[PDB]
Design a protein around this ligand. Structure first.
Ligand SMILES: Cc1cc2nc3c(=O)[nH]c(=O)nc-3n(C[C@H](O)[C@H](O)[C@H](O)COP(=O)(O)OP(=O)(O)OC[C@H]3O[C@@H](n4cnc5c(N)ncnc54)[C@H](O)[C@@H]3O)c2cc1C
Ligand SMILES: Cc1cc2nc3c(=O)[nH]c(=O)nc-3n(C[C@H](O)[C@H](O)[C@H](O)COP(=O)(O)OP(=O)(O)OC[C@H]3O[C@@H](n4cnc5c(N)ncnc54)[C@H](O)[C@@H]3O)c2cc1C
Ligand SMILES: Cc1cc2nc3c(=O)[nH]c(=O)nc-3n(C[C@H](O)[C@H](O)[C@H](O)COP(=O)(O)OP(=O)(O)OC[C@H]3O[C@@H](n4cnc5c(N)ncnc54)[C@H](O)[C@@H]3O)c2cc1C
Ligand SMILES: Cc1cc2nc3c(=O)[nH]c(=O)nc-3n(C[C@H](O)[C@H](O)[C@H](O)COP(=O)(O)OP(=O)(O)OC[C@H]3O[C@@H](n4cnc5c(N)ncnc54)[C@H](O)[C@@H]3O)c2cc1C
Ligand code: HEM
Ligand code: HEM
Ligand code: HEM
Ligand code: HEM
Ligand SMILES: [Cl-]
Ligand SMILES: [Cl-]
Ligand SMILES: [Cl-]
Ligand SMILES: [Cl-]
Ligand code: NA
Ligand code: NA
Ligand code: NA
Ligand code: NA
Ligand code: NA
Ligand code: NA
Ligand code: NA
Ligand code: NA
Lengths: 396, 396, 396, 396
């Protein structure tokens, strides 16, 4: 329960915080990992990372803690982060650790006196309690469902299938032979790994690709050049190996009625949540129009085109359109794509004059901003457009 | 995004608001129902009501709106109310209505000038947006699940079974013949009714009594003397009739692992969420100890004793104890109960020395406060005790 | 020439700016590209981008403009950005455009009144003049050198060589047959492209890979999956095609004497500036120790190993060590690498006990922070470590 | 990172500083040279000096340090001084020395109390860091270039040529037989000398007179009556002697395209940077008009007229005009000059109606202000006029 002065003391120190931007963050993470190295088992330590997740975390604490009074407007961003933390199994003790390093860094870098450090300790504390409370609800929801569980659960890789030159799907089934939790199409799983070559345990989020069946899950991974986890899954993981999973979480999912037209836009592996959504619509006999717009680099790298076809065939009103950005000669001779180049919806055969249509988007940031702006230029309201990033959360 | 002055203007008017307590509330509801009578189809209009739900709603708006800065601490209460609103299908337009009547009442009763009314309009608005945002997430979650739906759905009563002289269970199956949403044991359904004798549509919350099966639901209702909906369900509703349901919601549910000992305490019809919890544990082969402590007035009114027996028999470590507060002569000659009188856990054979045991409670307020205080007097931590009221939310 | 009040007016609006973080930025870029679409020919419009460059630009303007009094400490960051702008040919007119959109966005989003907007206009103006002045000096330096030029110059691709499965080098020679500017090993070129499939003109920075020779340049590009410019250069560009270049710029370069031991650390294509540095040392007969530590994923993707060998052979004191993170069976049978796994300098044969040794680093952010922290853990002072990012600038 | 009070404390002491003008400066230099005599090896100690360089240095520290907030506007003057310091090899330790003597003088002269001295120490420090940072970049740039070096390098005088009765050129080649750095026409060299008759080491700046060739440099010195270094170079220095040089620096240079008309104005030895510019244009085949306007006292003292002729002959559009201020009888009989008297451009045959023409000027201050004002009176914009002083920097 903060008061005006504490709140003004924190906001008064914000201008001092933004001009030290990167230095500050580095000092904070260098102090964290030195005294609390065990956190290296939760943060990404791959030499291939770019440092965005770290930067976003710290900036959010600074921006959220200083405007804790206006928390109301921050709740949608808090929900998105809380869902993600749940996959990384963030706990209340870790908030204490991050709090000690934040205040110690502020002191070490500025020596602001006790009043300032106390204020920041109170504002951070309130913010940390907001996340701890919501994350406790989600952990509880996940363990209460049928087939749900607390923490990490062991799952055997029961099938490894190459769906293209870059994507391979992995079927997973609990080692305990029991039921697995249900989820909302568009959500993801937390995959914890630490084969013997890993110097640290790595955790990655992979979307669920089909309708829930209470038996197992199916994820599809793209092999990223130099990527630690995707290359291990593609070159070393084998059917028979066991990995640990954290229940399904995520604030991006499809919620429509039977008469709600839906459009699923995606580029490359960003089609994984869309597959779960398409499978769900097909198995439900969705009666309204369903569109599947996808862009792949070429036919070599394009995955799941056969599954998408059989699923749309089962729907009453379904339309699919694929764009190959750089079709090979063989691709042109097979004609397995509709248009070449970027996804130009504006040139499709017929627009979506249905105000009730809902659009889901998932690809790289430039792709989603280019494709979401085409939609509003066509008249689509922003509240009907939904999207998800496979990296830190962005906005357009 | 409020500022210090607006916030101080609202808090400065709070002392003026608490001394007008009941008058104020009456003027607000009298103005609401006069200009917006359609809300009579959502609020309880039964002549048997006591007016607590109205009183709590208004007091919460006054207390929450004036301490909107400290919203963080209010989130657990906001979640409980948001889950309940979801059954009543509260919408954003209705928040506008409640806001117009709140400010109009303040003006009509005090003529505070525009500054005060503007402040209250801004604080209320922020509070209304918090509920609208969380309730929009829940509506989305409910429509995204398999078998889930938006709004109201028609369900046929496929079975009416008398389980005691006061309780009758009703099995319900979608009229559309499709799958129904899953839920977390301990949650409830929103039952919308308006047979031809009702002057208004009434909405009641009934707990789900068994493990989810994706096909239908089973609720158990106690006939309350003079109660509008329970007497219609007991004396007029018939197998074949159709009622409307709103997806399962609720913040009170069981979330345990397989090795988490659980204790289910209940009095009378308060055993309904416990049945869903016991059925869930039994079907999961729960290995840790499971206790079923129940209190009924007598054998005539005691329901589900046979089901509870067969379910516990299927568990490895199960212990049941029943207390009849006023056993009849016939009850004593049948010996279908363990102890007579109030639920005195302190005299049971063996306490719960397991610090990891979780306790769920559900009965009238006096029963739950008497039984929860026995547990902490025995050493049980408060965070291991969970409970739910079948009326406005209370605290002990 | 600002005064205390203007400066305090801008800093007082900073807390309002950080809590609108992403929204604000989006509104600013959406307004820019709508009214000044021609800027799409300068910013990256690839659908493969992640939006970091945009985010960093806007955040820097907010953080720099509000602490313009402390510009002194910002000059090293200003130099790094000014060098980069020079490749994109940023001009004073464009600063006017960015200024109009910044103030219009502030007004549109907050309606702060004229005083606030005037303050921000004055602080931004001072900041824009700092960049315009330094960038004018650099443009002048580039056009004054021998073989130097203003703007863009046409260069023919005279040689296309595949150096590995992912990297291909391109030799470039002026179409005018004249001399080309010299540069400082570690610097880069600005490559402007717009073949016929591009919807917009794209500009990318590629490091110079050899010692300057006043005749032409040689860049080495890694094919990024889905990357617009690298895939065009690898799959469509041909010897004979003409691209436009902007003189060499960059604040990251090697500056050592003949007796200064040097260590060149790099991962993958990050070895491009190191090649220019190694070629320079070899042609100068560097007498002090020169180390070449490189990490590649495997032998298929490892490029320039033969060139590095012949160059080190020409040096008196040279030591090379290569780490393959995921050696293939064929790689192990050829033995063309020293160690497998991550670059663990701590396990090399002998440390760098030379306090005068200078270290240059270039790879992904995680790689450079992991490798730079190993060096200071070994005792290397931070001022002896130098590095460069192929994406926005980071810090560890 | 200064604050309002420190900044106001320094500005409040400025009126006290300007009324002590010369006394103050003398006390500061007398205290410097007493405690830090080694600085006599860097400052000019010739008995022929007039004391302007000292006066300007001290006044700049007072004026810059007190308006450190408005540093932005001072950057062009900071660059000019930083380039010059680089020839004198100024270092960070020396800034500490100048700082100790500045504050000690303030105390000794006024006894202002600690608050004032602390403020001045903080403002000076910020200013000293600005110069140290830029000078570190320049030292790095100079050592990174090909043929570049750190510090001082030995160069043998390989040729001594008398070009007139007052000017003699000296060719210099590294004693190490290696390549020498390139430079921008108009820049200068730092020549360190201390033959055996010198009581102190003297450092002078001499412009480079030809296009860079990576082999050696050629400077042309005017014998100043009583001048220490110019008389040693003219009367005692011999081919074979070795002097020390500091890499080329300077902010005054020519930066034009091939179609940029250029005008080179100069009086006497001020033609040295112009020769480097003319040689550069001639070797590049400059296609636009090139003018060479020069004024010498007479034919005896006029140097390089033959070189300028052969160079202009090699250009397509070249026009030369020479003015002898006091032609001798022999000069008039030879007709080796165009007009007699001062350089009156206004009476030339045809003006420069080309708005894109760039003008470079170099002679004494009166000559440059007289000649630059003629140009703007003719319509030439000020930003197209460039000039350099062979003494402290002035302005007209
Ligand atoms: C909610 C969510 C859902 C996801 N669902 C899936 C899914 O269904 N399938 C799937 O394959 N992945 C999915 N991802 C992404 C995935 O979790 C990881 O990024 C991935 O597995 C990285 O693995 P790693 O082991 O290769 O590499 P790391 O070592 O972390 O490497 C990351 C790699 O990405 C590369 N990269 C390419 N473009 C970018 C870019 N724009 N920014 C940053 N790095 C870039 C790097 O070069 C590097 O190889 C999801 C991510 C999120 C946040
Ligand atoms: C989360 C939740 C879950 C519930 N689950 C169930 C369930 O599984 N089964 C079930 O039978 N009911 C359950 N209820 C209660 C139920 O929703 C209603 O109170 C009930 O159906 C009232 O119905 P009505 O039609 O009889 O009467 P109304 O006309 O609203 O009458 C309410 C009646 O309750 C009587 N009453 C008795 N004690 C009290 C008291 N202490 N305070 C107020 N009124 C009292 C009144 O005398 C009156 O007859 C739940 C309520 C909540 C909030
Ligand atoms: C100073 C400087 C010097 C450079 N020198 C070279 C050089 O010598 N050689 C060279 O090959 N490149 C160099 N680069 C990088 C290069 O300029 C570009 O990033 C590149 O050409 C991108 O080209 P594009 O056409 O493929 O793709 P865009 O469409 O812009 O695609 C960028 C791509 O990078 C991928 N990516 C992988 N990892 C990441 C990550 N961590 N963050 C963001 N995107 C990621 C994306 O998946 C995507 O394919 C340099 C960059 C800088 C700033
Ligand atoms: C950027 C720059 C570039 C230069 N390039 C050249 C060049 O290419 N060629 C060249 O010959 N010199 C050049 N000079 C000038 C030169 O560096 C020195 O002033 C010179 O060598 C002085 O040398 P010194 O040994 O004679 O005398 P000092 O003992 O320092 O004597 C200076 C002398 O100048 C005389 N003098 C004449 N007019 C003035 C005046 N108006 N103000 C002050 N003293 C005056 C004095 O009478 C005295 O003899 C340059 C100076 C600068 C700052
Ligand atoms: C109140 C404080 C916190 C806030 C405001 C916060 C905010 C964030 C944000 C903004 C992100 C990026 C979200 C995105 O991907 O969309 C993030 C990621 C993450 N957070 Fe939190 N966070 C906080 C506390 C914590 C704590 C205590 C830990 C525990 C050690 C933690 C660990 C993580 C991890 C591991 C990631 C993923 C980054 C990775 O992949 O390397 N966070 N957080
Ligand atoms: C921001 C404002 C609101 C707050 C703080 C609020 C608070 C509450 C509270 C405290 C309760 C009792 C919860 C309990 O049973 O545990 C409640 C019940 C209820 N609320 Fe809300 N409420 C708000 C707005 C609304 C709106 C706009 C409507 C729509 C007309 C509404 C309709 C109801 C109904 C119907 C009930 C059940 C009462 C009954 O059964 O008669 N509420 N609310
Ligand atoms: C005073 C204002 C400005 C500041 C503080 C600023 C700052 C920055 C920063 C921090 C970056 C990232 C640097 C990194 O890669 O290390 C950047 C990139 C860039 N800036 Fe500036 N900038 C400013 C004005 C401008 C203007 C007027 C334009 C012209 C339209 C511009 C165009 C760019 C471009 C094109 C990039 C590269 C991003 C890309 O690749 O898409 N900047 N700037
Ligand atoms: C932050 C402080 C400084 C400022 C503002 C400054 C300013 C100046 C100025 C205005 C000039 C004349 C430039 C002209 O010829 O156009 C100059 C010359 C010079 N400065 Fe600096 N200076 C500073 C610190 C230093 C230091 C620490 C030294 C080292 C002992 C130094 C040594 C010199 C020398 C040797 C000259 C040439 C004078 C001569 O030929 O005798 N300066 N400086
Ligand atoms: Cl990261
Ligand atoms: Cl009521
Ligand atoms: Cl970007
Ligand atoms: Cl002097
Ligand atoms: Na890790
Ligand atoms: Na694909
Ligand atoms: Na009603
Ligand atoms: Na009962
Ligand atoms: Na572009
Ligand atoms: Na490589
Ligand atoms: Na001297
Ligand atoms: Na002359």
């Amino acid at each position: 329960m903060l008061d005006a002065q504490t709140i003004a003391t924190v906001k008064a120190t914000i201008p001092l915080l933004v001009e030290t931007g990167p230095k500050l963050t580095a000092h904070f993470y260098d102090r964290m990992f030195t005294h609390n190295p065990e956190l290296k088992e939760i943060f990404n330590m791959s030499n291939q990372r770019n440092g965005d997740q770290r930067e976003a975390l710290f900036n959010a604490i600074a921006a959220y803690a200083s405007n804790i009074e206006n928390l109301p407007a921050l709740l949608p961003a808090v929900e998105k982060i809380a869902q993600k933390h749940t996959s990384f199994q963030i706990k209340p003790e870790q908030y204490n650790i991050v709090g000690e390093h934040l205040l110690a860094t502020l002191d070490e870098m500025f020596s602001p006196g006790q009043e300032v450090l106390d204020a920041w300790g109170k504002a951070y504390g309130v913010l940390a309690n907001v996340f701890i409370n919501r994350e406790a609800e989600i952990y509880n929801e996940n363990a209460s469902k049928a087939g749900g569980w607390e923490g990490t659960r062991d799952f055997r890789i029961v099938a490894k299938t190459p769906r293209s030159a870059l994507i391979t799907s992995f079927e997973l089934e609990p080692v305990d032979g029991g039921a697995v939790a249900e989820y909302r199409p568009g959500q993801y799983l937390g995959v914890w790994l630490k084969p013997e070559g890993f110097p640290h345990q790595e955790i990655r989020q992979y979307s669920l690709t089909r309708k829930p069946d209470g038996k197992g899950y199916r994820i599809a991974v793209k092999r990223e050049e130099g990527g630690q986890v995707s290359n291990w899954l593609h070159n070393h993981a084998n059917v028979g190996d066991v990995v640990k999973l954290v229940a399904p979480a995520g604030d991006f999912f499809m919620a429509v009625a039977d008469d709600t037209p839906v459009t699923l836009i995606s580029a490359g592996v960003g089609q994984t949540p869309m597959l779960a959504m398409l499978d769900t619509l097909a198995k439900a006999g969705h009666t309204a129009q369903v569109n599947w717009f996808h862009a792949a680099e070429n036919g070599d790298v394009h995955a799941f085109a056969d599954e998408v076809k059989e699923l749309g065939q089962s729907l009453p009103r379904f339309t699919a359109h694929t764009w190959y950005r750089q079709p090979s000669e063989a691709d042109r001779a097979k004609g397995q794509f509709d248009s070449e180049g970027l996804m130009d919806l504006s040139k499709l055969e017929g627009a979506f004059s249905d105000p009730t249509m809902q659009f889901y988007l998932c690809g790289p940031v430039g792709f989603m901003q280019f494709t979401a702006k085409q939609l509003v230029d066509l008249g689509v309201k922003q509240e009907n457009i939904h999207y998800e990033c496979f990296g830190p959360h962005k906005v357009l």
